[PDB]
Structure 1
Amino acid sequence: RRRQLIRQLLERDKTPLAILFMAAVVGTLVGLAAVAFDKGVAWLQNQRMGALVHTADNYPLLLTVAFLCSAVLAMFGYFLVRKYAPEAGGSGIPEIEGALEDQRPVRWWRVLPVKFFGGLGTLGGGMVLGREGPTVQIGGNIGRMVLDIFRLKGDEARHTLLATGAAAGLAAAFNAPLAGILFIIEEMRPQFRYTLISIKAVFIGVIMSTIMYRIFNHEVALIDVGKLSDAPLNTLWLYLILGIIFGIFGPIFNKWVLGMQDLLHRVHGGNITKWVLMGGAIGGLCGLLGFVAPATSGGGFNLIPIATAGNFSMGMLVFIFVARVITTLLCFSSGAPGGIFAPMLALGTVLGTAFGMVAVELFPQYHLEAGTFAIAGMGALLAASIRAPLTGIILVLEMTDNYQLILPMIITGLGATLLAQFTGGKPLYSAILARTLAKQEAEQ
C-alpha cells in the first residue's frame, strides 16, 4: 500500500478551488444569519422587558404578562417545529451530525425558516436554551442550500460545505473560530470511518462567519471575567477532583435529559396541540422565572461573570444549580428548538465556582481564587455530557482568555470525560442521533 501512499502524500491538501470559494460563501451567509438570529432574539427579550414596565405596578398583572409573552413565543416556536420541520426540534447538532453520516436529510427549504423563526420564539421568549443549536443546524442547512443551488458534485463537497456550515455556525454563536473548527473535527464529522472534509475549507468558512459577527458585534465580549490568578503545581490535584465530580455527574445528567424526553412525550403523545400548549407552559414558566429569579432562566451568560467573581453565596449557588438543571431539562427535553450546549456552560461555571469556594476555606495555604475553579468548570459539563473536551477547553479559552489556567482546564475536562466513560455514560449528541435513527427503523 506503499506506492499508493507515496502518490497520496504528494497529492495532499489540494482542495478544489470550487469548494474553497464556496466555503467562503457558506461562511458569509451563516454569519449574517447568526447575526440576525442574535439581533432578533435580543429584540424580543427587550420588548418583553418593555411590557413589564408598561405594567410595573400590578404585580399579579405583571406576573401574568411575563408568563403569556413567553408562552406565545414558545408556542409559536413549538408550532413551527411540529407543523413544518420536526427535525428542527431539539438541539440541531445531532441532526447535522446525521447529515454528515448521510443518514439524515438536510431539508433546507423548511428548516431554515423553521429553525430561525422557531428558535427566535423559544430563545427570544427567554427559554433556557442556546443559540448554537439553531446556528449550527441553520449553518449546515445553508451549507446544503449553496450546494444544491450551484449543483456542486462530489462527496468531498457535500461533506465539506456541510461541515463548514456547522463550524461557521458554532463560531458565530460564541465569537469562537477555533472552537468551531475544532468542534467539527472532534465531534461533528463522522466518527467511525474516513471522510474527505477539507479542514482548510472549514477554516475559510469559519473566518468569514467570524468577520460578519465582528462587523455587527464589536467591542463587547459575551463573557468578561477579567484576568484571574495562576495555578501552582501543588494545586493541580484539586482540579482532577473537580473533573471526577463532573465525570460522574455527566452521565447522570445525560439520563435525565433522555428520560425527560420520554416522560414529556407522554403528555402530548405526538399531538401538535397538546405539544404546542405544553410549549407555552414551559415557555411561560421561563418568562415568569426570568422576572422573579432571572438566574434560573434564560441563556445564563449573565451569571457567568458573577460566579467567577465570588459574588454569589454558596446558598445562591446551590439554588441556581438545582433550579437550572430543572429548567434546562424542561426546555430542552421538551423538544423546543434550541441548543443545550451553552446552558451547560452556566451549569459548569456554577458548580465549579461552588467547588472553588469550598476549596478556598479548606485550603488557605494554597491562596485560592474560587474563580479559577469556575473557569475549569465552565467547559466541564461539555466534557462529561457531550464528551467533546478538546472543544469545551478551547471554547472556554476563547471566551474567558485566561490561558494561565490551561493545565487546570485540561485536567478537569479530562477527568470529567474519563469518569463519564468509566461510569457508563455516552456522548449526548450521539445518544440522541441514535434513538432518532432507531425510531427510523422501529416503526418499519
Structure 2
Amino acid sequence: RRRQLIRQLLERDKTPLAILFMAAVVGTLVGLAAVAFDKGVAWLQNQRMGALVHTADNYPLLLTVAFLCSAVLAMFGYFLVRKYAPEAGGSGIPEIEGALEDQRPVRWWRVLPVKFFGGLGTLGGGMVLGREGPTVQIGGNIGRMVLDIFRLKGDEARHTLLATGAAAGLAAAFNAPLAGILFIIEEMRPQFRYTLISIKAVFIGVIMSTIMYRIFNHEVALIDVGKLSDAPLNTLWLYLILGIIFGIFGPIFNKWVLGMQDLLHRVHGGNITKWVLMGGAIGGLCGLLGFVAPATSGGGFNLIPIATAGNFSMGMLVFIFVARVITTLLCFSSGAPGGIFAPMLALGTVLGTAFGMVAVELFPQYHLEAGTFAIAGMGALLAASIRAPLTGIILVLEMTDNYQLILPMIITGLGATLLAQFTGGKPLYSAILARTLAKQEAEQ
C-alpha cells in the first residue's frame, strides 16, 4: 500500500473544476437566502413592535396583541412544518448531518419553503431560537438543489456541495466564515469513516456566502464587545474552573432538551392541531416576554454586549439565565423551526459573566474584568452541549475579536468538553440524529 500512497499523494487536492464552480454557486445562493431570511425575521419583529405602539396605552390590551401577534406567527410556523415538511422542525443541523451520512433525505422542494417561511414565523415572532438552524438546513438543501438541477453525479459532489451549503449557512448566520468551514470539518462531516469532502470547495461557498452577507449587512456587527483586557497566566486556572462548570452543566442541559421533547410530545401526541396550538402558546409567551422582560425572550444577541460590559446585576444574570434556560427548552424542544446554537451563546455569556462577577470580588489582585469570563463562557455551552469546541471557540473569536483571550477561551472550552465527556454526556446534535434514526427503525 506504499505504492498507492505515492499515487494518492501526487494526486492530492485536485478538486474537480465542476465541483469548485458549483460550490461558488451554492454559497452565493445560500448567502442571499440567509440574508433574505435575516431581513424577514427583522421586519416581522419590527411590525410587532409597531403594533404594541398602536395600543401603547391599554396595558392588558397591549399585553394581548403582543401575545397574539407572536402566537399566530408561531402557529403558522409549526403548521408549515407539521404539514409539508416534518424534517424542517427543530434545528435542522441534525438532519443535514444525517444527509451527509446518506441516512436522511434532502427534500429541498419541501424544506426550502417550509424552513424559510416556518422559521420566519418562529424567529420573527421572537421565539428563543437561532438563525443557524434554518440557514444551515436551508443551505444544505440549496446545495442539494443545485446538485439535482445540474445533475452533478458522484459521491464527492453530493457530499461537498451539501457540506459547502451547510457551511455557507452557518457562516452567513454569524458573519463567521472560518467558523462555518470549521463546523463542517469538526462536526458536520461523517464522523466515523472517510469522506470525499473538498475543503477548498467548502471554502469557496463560505466566501461567496460571507461576501453576500457583507453586501447587505456591512458596518454593523451582530455583537460588539470592544477590546477587553488581557488575561495573565496566573489567571488561567480560573477559566479551567469555569470550563469544568460548563462541563457538568452541559450534559444536564442536554438531558433537558431531549427530555423536554418527550414531555412536550405528550401535550399534542403528534397531532397537528394540538401541536400548532401548543406552538402558538409557546410563541405567544415569548412575544409577551419580549415586552415584559425582553432578555428572557428573543435570540439573545442583544444582552451579550450588555452582560459582557458588566451592566447587569448578579441577580439579573441569575434571572436571565434561569428564565432563558426555560424559554430555550420550550422553544427548541417543542419542535419549532429554529436552532439552539445561538441561544446557547447567550446562555454561556450570562453564566460566564456570573462567574466573572464572583471572580472579580474574590481576587482583586488579579485585576479581573468579568467580561473576559463572559467571552470565555460564550462558546462554552456549545463546547459542552454540542461538543464542538473548536467551532465555538473560533466562532466567538470571529464575533468578539478578542484574540488576547484565546487561552482562556480554549481552556474553558476544552475544560467544558472534557467534563462533558467524563460526566456521561453526548453531542446534542448527534444525540438527536440518533434519536431520529433509531425511531426510524423503532416503528418497524
TM-score bucket (shorter structure): over 0.9
For 1:430 and 1:76, how far apart are their aligned partners in 2?
28
Deviations 1:266-324 (A, max 9, x none): 00001000000000000000000000000000000000000000100000000000000
Deviations 1:89-110 (A, max 9, x none): 0001000000000000000000
The CA deviation at 1:214 is 0.5
Please report the RMSD computed on the Cα atoms of aligned residues, expressed in angstroms: 0.2
Aligned sequence identity (%): 100
Partner of 1:364: 364
Deviations 1:65-117 (A, max 9, x none): 00000000000000000000000000010000000000000000000000000
Partner of 1:135: 135
The CA deviation at 1:416 is 0.3
Secondary structure class of the residue paired with 1:365: helix
For 2:243 and 2:442, how far apart are their aligned partners in 1?
37
What pairs with 1:39-438 in structure 2 (closer than 5 Å)?
A: 39-438=39-438
Q: Which runs of 5+ in 1 are unaligned?
A: none
The CA deviation at 1:188 is 0.1
Structure 1 stretches of 4+ with a deviation exceeding 3 A read: none
TM normalised by structure 1 equals: 1.00
The CA deviation at 1:43 is 0.2
The CA deviation at 1:179 is 0.1
For 1:189 and 1:362, how far apart are their aligned partners in 2?
43
For 1:145 and 1:310, how far apart are their aligned partners in 2?
46
Secondary structure class of the residue paired with 1:133: helix
Deviations 1:236-264 (A, max 9, x none): 00000000000000000000000000000
The CA deviation at 1:126 is 0.3
For 1:145 and 1:329, how far apart are their aligned partners in 2?
32
Answering whether residue 14 of structure 2 is matched by residue 14 of structure 1, we say: yes
The CA deviation at 1:46 is 0.1
Aligned residues: 444
TM normalised by structure 2 equals: 1.00
Deviations 1:177-221 (A, max 9, x none): 000000000000000000000000000000000000010000000
Secondary structure class of the residue paired with 2:342: helix
Secondary structure class of the residue paired with 1:425: coil
The CA deviation at 1:413 is 0.2
For 2:317 and 2:441, how far apart are their aligned partners in 1?
44
For 1:385 and 1:362, how far apart are their aligned partners in 2?
28
For 2:426 and 2:373, how far apart are their aligned partners in 1?
25
The CA deviation at 1:229 is 0.2
Q: Which runs of 5+ in 2 are unaligned?
A: none
Deviations 1:30-86 (A, max 9, x none): 000000000000000000000000000000000000000000000000000000000
For 1:58 and 1:440, how far apart are their aligned partners in 2?
50
For 1:253 and 1:435, how far apart are their aligned partners in 2?
17
The CA deviation at 1:427 is 0.1
For 2:153 and 2:20, how far apart are their aligned partners in 1?
14
For 1:263 and 1:54, how far apart are their aligned partners in 2?
38
The CA deviation at 1:18 is 0.1
For 1:31 and 1:348, how far apart are their aligned partners in 2?
27
For 2:42 and 2:371, how far apart are their aligned partners in 1?
28
Deviations 1:152-199 (A, max 9, x none): 000000000000000000000000000000000000000000000000
For 2:92 and 2:273, how far apart are their aligned partners in 1?
23
For 1:424 and 1:130, how far apart are their aligned partners in 2?
27
Secondary structure class of the residue paired with 1:193: coil
For 2:370 and 2:425, how far apart are their aligned partners in 1?
28
For 1:373 and 1:145, how far apart are their aligned partners in 2?
42
For 2:358 and 2:407, how far apart are their aligned partners in 1?
21
The CA deviation at 1:382 is 0.2
For 1:239 and 1:126, how far apart are their aligned partners in 2?
33
The CA deviation at 1:433 is 0.2
Secondary structure class of the residue paired with 1:54: coil
For 1:377 and 1:178, how far apart are their aligned partners in 2?
20
Deviations 1:396-415 (A, max 9, x none): 00000000000000000000
The CA deviation at 1:119 is 0.2
